[PDB]
Amino acid sequence: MKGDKKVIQHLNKILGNELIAINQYFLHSRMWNDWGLKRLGAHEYHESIDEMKHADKLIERILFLEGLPNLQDLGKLLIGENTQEMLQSDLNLELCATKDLREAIVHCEQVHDYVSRDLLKDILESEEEHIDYLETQLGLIQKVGLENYLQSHMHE
């Protein structure tokens, strides 16, 4: 086993967070489409795809390090009941997920696994972009009002 055991555990934890996000964002996307909020549905679909790509890269790295990728354990999805709750739930997931990424990067640095660190840092940048998007949407609801915000997300 070339990989550090705790690096592989961290990568499996990040992978687990990505698997939650894939499903949460995909369901939220299709809920927004069901409600006719097609601009939100499309954006959230692309967020789900992005997490799928991150999961792929993590799986590939874990296998290279001779670990066993964990696609069996799926943690808790938090599905919102309206647009505000869904955006907030995605934000909660990302805030928790970025904390785990930082902890994983610390450990990779400590054991000199600089390539795993670089992979995690690229994922972290994408997740901070998603936090930027989510916080901005919640702010727009405050600034333009919920009804206007939803109206602006009806059409793609």
Ligand X SMILES: O=C1NC(=O)c2cc(O)ccc21
Q: Binding site for Fe(2+): residue ranges?
A: 18, 51, 54, 94, 127, 130
Separation in Å, CA 150 to CA 19, 28, 91, 137, 153: 28, 15, 18, 10, 5
Instruction: List b or e across 132-146, with b for residues whose CB sees 16 or more CB atoms inside 10 angstroms.
Output: ebbeebeeebeeeee
Residue numbering of the annotated binding site: 18, 51-52, 54, 94, 127, 130, 148, 151
Residue numbering of the annotated binding site for heme b: 52
The least CB distance from residue 15 to ligand HEM, in Å, is 8
Separation in Å, CA 43 to CA 26, 130, 140, 153: 10, 11, 16, 10
Which partner, ligand HEM, ligand X, a second copy, none, binds residue 46 by CB below 5 to 8 Å per kind?
none
The burial class, CB within 10 Å (0-12 / 13-18 / 19+), for 125 is exposed
CA-CA distance, 34 to 101, in Å (whole number)? 33
Chain residues 33-52 in contact with ligand HEM, contact rule CB under 6 A = 49, 52
Which partner, a second copy, ligand HEM, ligand X, none, binds residue 114 by CB below 5 to 8 Å per kind?
a second copy
Instruction: Name the residue nearer to ligand HEM (CB basis): 52 or 141.
Output: 52
Using CB under 5 A as the binding criterion, the count of chain residues that bind K ion stands at 1
Backbone dihedral angles phi then psi of residue 155, each to the nearest 5 degrees: -95, 140
Chain residues 64-123 in contact with ligand HEM, contact rule CB under 6 A = 71
Chain residues 137-156 in contact with ligand HEM, contact rule CB under 6 A = none
**Residue 64 engages a second copy in binding (rule: CB under 8 A):** yes
Instruction: Name the residue nearer to ligand HEM (CB basis): 63 or 106.
Output: 63
Q: How many residues does the chain have?
A: 156
Residues that bind ligand HEM (CB under 6 A): 19, 22-23, 26, 49, 52-53, 55-56, 71
